[PDB]
């Protein structure tokens, strides 16, 4: 957590500069937006029955006898993250629909990316898959002052305003104390 951050400005269209009583905050815009998107998708994937949307271009996949074994093992886990596989023929599946909240235009690559995660873990439970899926979903010109403000406000009210879902810094903070030291 962190108190209200007041915008100073932005630079190179990459970083936001802000301040409050605790000192100075340098904020990576992109990282901040991953974190904010994550808090959203992590909730969405936790829903038992999400609004569903029928695709326009349905997808097909095909797997080795072994990959299909793993996929049948993880039916419930895959469906719980929004991947609705229907097997037609041998080791082949169609995807006919998905949650309405999947990131538009990247459903195809998301579904295949999630399915690939399961094939790699070989044995994975729902909680871990939900985390992984939401991380994947989260990473699917200069900002206006109103845009900087919404961003600082949204970031502040997430679970971890300091670190992106991939574990990288969102915020470099120079405290009042640290700046006093820096300069004396």
Judge contact between 152 and 5, C-beta under 8 A.
yes
User: Within 17-46, which residues bind Zn ion (CB under 5 A)?
Assistant: 34
Measured distance CA(92)–CA(70) in Å, rounded: 13
Q: 85: which 2 tokens?
A: 């596989």
- Which of 8, 68, 126, 139 forms a contact with a copy of itself (CB under 8 A)? 8
Residues near 19 by beta carbon (within 8 Å), at least 6 away in sequence: 5, 6, 8, 25
Smallest separation, CB 135 to Zn ion (Å): 8
Interaction of residue 179 with a copy of itself, rule CB under 8 A: yes
Interaction of residue 168 with a copy of itself, rule CB under 8 A: yes
Binding span for a copy of itself by CB under 8 A among 47-55, 62-70, 131-139, 168-176: 168-176
Burial, 146: exposed, middle or buried (Cβ in 10 Å; 0-12, 13-18, 19+)? exposed
Q: 46: which 2 tokens?
A: 């936790």
In sequence order, what are the beta bridge partners of 18? 7, 25
Residue 15 binds which entry of a copy of itself, Zn ion, none, CB below 5-8 Å type-dependent? a copy of itself
Judge contact between 14 and 29, C-beta under 8 A.
yes
Binding span for Zn ion by CB under 5 A among 56-64, 78-86, 132-140, 152-160: 132-140
Site string for a copy of itself, 111-150 (x = CB under 8 A): ----------------------------------------
Smallest separation, CB 4 to Zn ion (Å): 24
């Amino acid at each position: 957590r962190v108190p209200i951050m007041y915008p100073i400005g932005q630079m190179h269209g990459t970083y936001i500069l802000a301040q409050n009583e605790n000192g100075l905050y340098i904020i990576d815009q992109h990282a901040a937006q991953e974190r904010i998107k994550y808090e959203y998708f992590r909730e969405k994937v936790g829903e038992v029955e999400p609004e569903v949307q029928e695709m326009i271009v349905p997808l097909t996949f095909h797997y080795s006898t072994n990959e299909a074994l793993i996929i049948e093992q993880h039916k419930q886990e895959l469906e719980s993250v929004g991947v609705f596989l229907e097997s037609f023929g041998s080791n082949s599946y169609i995807v006919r629909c998905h949650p309405a909240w999947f990131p538009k235009g990247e459903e195809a690559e998301l579904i295949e990316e999630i399915i690939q995660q399961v094939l790699d873990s070989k044995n994975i439970d729902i909680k871990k898959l939900r985390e992984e899926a939401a991380i994947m979903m989260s990473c699917k010109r200069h900002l206006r002052n109103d845009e900087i403000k919404a961003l600082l406000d949204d970031l502040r009210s997430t679970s971890d305003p300091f670190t992106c879902p991939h574990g990288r810094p969102i915020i470099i903070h120079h405290s009042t104390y640290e700046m006093e030291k820096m300069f004396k």
